[PDB]
Symmetry: C2
Subunit: 420 residues, 2 copies
C-alpha cells in the first residue's frame, strides 16, 4: 500500500472509475479505495468490505467484482509513512474518484481531505430499519440531507472578544457602516456564496433524478438572514429553474398550472423556514425526501432526523465533490469500544452501500445490504447499542453481526429483494 | 378610553401598579396588567385569556386577588383610534405597568419580519425570550411527549438574528471582503453574501442569570446550555463559558457543574443543587427527542433557542398551543408564539390555549401567582382529556364535534369553577 505519490499502485485486477465530461464512468471490475482509519474504524471498515463483497457477488452473479484498494490515514499511516495524512492518500482518492473511510482521530483530519479534494457536498441519508424509536412516525422518515459543507459559520471565520483582531473589526464596522457591536463580544462571520449554493443544489437535483425523488426542500432562515440564507434559497431555486426546468416544479406552479397536484415525473422544489423545517420533519415526515441546506441547518436537521428513527449510532454519510466521493460514518473513533468487538458496524456498512449503490449506480447492492440490516433488527440479532433497548435480548458481537448479515444477503431470494 | 397619547395614560380605577425597585418585583393583590388585543385572532384569544385568568384568580384566591386589566393599543385598533400602529403611549404604558399580555400583530407594509414586535422588544429592552413547552394530552408524534416539560431561555438580541449582513453584490460586502483579506488573510468568494455573528459577555450573563433565577423559583433540577462551541469557539463557545462563569460566580451555593458531579460528588446528582450542564447543539436536538426527561431549563443564544423551542413544541403536538414571554429587567410582555391567523379571525374558531397559557406564564411565573398556573393547566388538560376542544385539536380526534372559541372558553371556566382545590393545588400553594 502506497506511501508516496510515485508508489501509487492500484490492484491489477480492476479498472478505474472515470470522470471527463459530466458523466461518471463505472466499469464492472471497479477499483474503490478503502481507508481503515482509527479506533473502531479498522473494526468496521473490514466489517463492511466483507459484507458489501458477499453482496456484490450475490447480487450480480459474478459478472461484477469490486476491487478493494488500500490507502493509509491516521495511526496506520503514521506507523508506516510517518505522517497522519500523506499526499499519496489524497492523490490515491483523486485517481480512484471513489473511496470508503473509517473515522479518524484528531490530536480535524476529515476537513483536510474535504478541502484538498473539494468535497463540498455532505450527504446524509436517514431511514428507518425497524429499531426501537421515539418517533411514532419513524417508519415514514425516508430522507437524504444535502448539506453545503464549505461555508457558513462553520468556515471558522471568528475572533476572540478580547483579541486585537476583534477590536480592529469592531472599529472598522462602526466607522464604515455605523454597526455597533459591544466591546465584550466575540465575532464570527457567515459567508454564503452563489457558486457553493449552486454546486450543492445541482448535486441534490441530480440525486433526486437518479432515485426518482419527488420533493426537494430548501431549508433556510431567509426571512431573518436575507443576504446569506435568503440568498441561498434564491440561488437554489434559480439553478433549479435554470438547469432542471423540465424536471422541476415549484409550489406556486403546482397551485396555478396543475390543479394543486405535483405532476408524476416531476420534482416539487420547495422551501421551509429552518425552525419550521424541524417541526415539519417531526409532524409530517412523509412530506419530505431530499433536504437541501447550508452547513449549520444541514448539521442540525440530519442529527434531528437520525434521533427520530433511533438511528443516532447508525447514521451513514458521504462527502462529494465534482467527480469524486468519500463515504464515512457520522460517528467518531469511539476509543472505548475499539478492539472490544462490541461496536455497531451498521454505519460503516451503510456508508459503503451509499457510495457503491447510491452514487456509483449499483442500486441492487443497496437493496440487499438494507434488506439484511432490517432482517437483523426484525429478529433481534444485533449489537449491544441496539440490544440494550430490547427486552431480554442478548447482544450479538461485531464479527457475529457481520456474518449474520452476509447470511441474510446470500440466503435471500432476489425476486423479493429486487422488484419494480 | 384606551390611550393614544402620553397625557391620556391613566391606569384603571381600583388597580395598584406592580413595582420593581432594588431588584425585586412587588406584585400587589390588585395589580394593574396591561393588555393589547392585537390583530387577526388577537382580540378573540386575548378576550378568552382575560376571562379564563379572571376565573382562575377568583377561584384560587377567593376574591382577595383580582387583576385590574388595562387596555393599550397596537396594530389595527391603534391605527383606527390613534392613526398609527404603535403609539409611544402604548410603550410608555407597558413600562409603567411592567407586565402586559398581548395578541399577535400583523407586520406592516414592507418594514421587516414582525417589526412591531421587534419595536416593542427593543424599546423596552426585553432581552430574554422565554418559551415553556409542556404536554397537555393532545395527540402527538413523540412517544415520550408526556416526558417533555421544558422551558427555553433564548437570548433574543444578538447572534446572526441581529441583522448584520450585506448582499453578495453590494459595495459594502465588497469592502468587507477586501478588509478581511488584506488585514487577516481571510478568503471569501466574490459571489458570497456576508453575515456577522456577535455574542457578548453582557448579553449572555443577563440571560443566564434570569434562567437560574427561574430555575430557583420553579425548583428546577437541571439547566442546560445549548451551544455549538466546538466549531464556533469565540461566539457559541464563549456563550457557554460565560454562562458557566456567572453560574459559579453568582449562584455557587445553589449550583453544581457536571464536570464536577461524577468526579467530586456522589456520581449521581446530589440533593438540593441545580445541575448546570451543556450540550452540543445538534446533539441537544437529538437529546430532547431521545431522553426528554433529562432536560428542564435550556439556555441558548438566539438561533439555537429559536430552533430547539420549535422542535420541542412539535414533539408535544403543541405547535399552535405554544406560549411565550419576552422579559427584561423589571418587565415582561407575554404572547403566543403563533401569528394573527387571518383566515380564522372573527370566526370564533381559533384555539385560545396559546394566549391563555401566555397569560398563565405571565401571571403564574413572572408575577408569582403559582396557583393560577396550576388551575389553568389543570383545566386545559381536563378539556383535552374530555375531548372538549377547538377544531385544531378536534380534527385529530375522530367523530368529535369541535368547540367554537367562546364555547371552549366557557368549558375551561366551568372546569376551573368546579375544580377540587385539595387535589389541583396539592403541594402547589403559597
Amino acid at each position: 500500500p502506497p506511501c508516496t505519490t510515485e508508489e501509487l499502485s492500484p490492484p491489477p485486477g480492476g479498472s478505474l472509475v472515470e470522470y471527463s465530461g459530466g458523466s461518471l464512468r463505472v466499469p464492472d471490475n471497479p477499483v474503490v479505495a478503502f481507508i481503515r482509519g482509527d479506533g473502531v474504524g479498522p473494526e468496521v471498515v473490514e466489517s463492511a468490505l466483507k459484507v458489501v463483497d458477499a453482496a456484490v457477488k450475490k447480487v450480480y452473479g459474478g459478472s461484477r467484482r469490486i476491487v478493494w484498494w488500500e490507502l493509509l490515514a491516521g495511526h496506520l499511516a503514521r506507523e508506516k509513512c510517518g505522517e497522519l495524512l500523506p499526499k499519496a492518500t489524497l492523490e490515491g482518492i483523486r485517481l480512484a474518484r471513489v473511496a470508503l473511510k473509517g473515522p479518524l482521530e484528531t490530536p480535524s483530519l476529515n476537513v483536510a481531505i474535504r478541502q484538498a479534494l473539494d468535497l463540498y457536498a455532505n450527504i446524509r441519508p436517514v431511514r428507518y430499519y425497524g429499531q426501537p424509536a421515539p418517533h411514532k412516525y419513524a417508519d415514514r422518515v425516508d430522507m437524504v440531507i444535502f448539506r453545503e459543507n464549505t461555508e457558513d459559520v462553520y468556515a471558522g471565520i471568528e475572533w476572540p472578544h478580547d483579541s486585537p483582531e476583534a477590536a480592529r473589526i469592531r472599529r472598522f464596522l462602526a466607522e464604515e457602516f455605523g454597526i455597533s457591536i459591544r466591546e465584550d463580544a466575540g465575532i464570527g462571520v457567515k459567508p454564503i456564496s452563489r457558486f457553493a449554493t449552486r454546486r450543492l443544489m445541482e448535486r441534490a437535483l441530480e440525486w433526486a433524478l437518479r432515485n426518482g425523488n419527488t420533493v426537494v426542500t430548501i431549508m433556510h432562515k431567509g426571512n431573518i438572514m436575507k443576504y446569506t440564507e435568503g440568498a441561498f434559497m434564491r440561488w437554489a431555486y434559480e439553478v433549479a429553474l435554470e438547469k432542471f426546468r423540465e424536471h422541476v416544479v415549484t409550489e406556486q406552479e403546482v397551485q396555478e398550472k396543475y390543479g394543486g397536484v405535483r405532476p408524476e415525473g416531476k420534482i416539487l422544489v420547495n422551501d421551509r423556514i429552518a425552525d419550521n423545517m424541524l417541526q415539519q420533519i417531526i409532524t409530517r415526515p412523509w412530506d419530505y425526501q431530499v433536504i437541501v441546506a447550508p452547513n449549520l441547518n444541514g448539521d442540525y436537521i440530519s442529527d434531528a432526523a437520525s434521533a427520530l428513527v433511533g438511528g443516532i449510532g447508525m447514521a451513514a454519510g458521504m462527502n462529494m465533490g465534482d467527480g469524486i466521493a468519500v463515504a464515512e460514518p457520522v460517528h467518531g473513533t469511539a476509543p472505548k469500544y475499539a478492539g472490544k468487538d462490541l461496536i455497531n458496524p451498521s454505519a460503516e456498512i451503510l456508508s459503503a452501500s451509499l457510495l457503491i449503490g447510491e452514487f456509483m449506480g449499483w442500486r441492487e447492492v443497496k437493496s440487499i445490504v438494507e434488506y439484511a440490516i432490517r432482517k437483523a433488527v426484525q429478529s433481534k440479532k444485533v449489537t449491544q447499542d441496539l440490544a440494550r433497548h430490547m427486552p431480554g435480548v442478548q447482544p450479538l458481537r461485531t464479527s457475529e453481526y457481520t456474518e449474520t448479515l452476509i447470511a441474510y444477503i446470500d440466503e435471500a431470494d432476489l425476486n423479493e429483494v429486487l422488484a419494480g
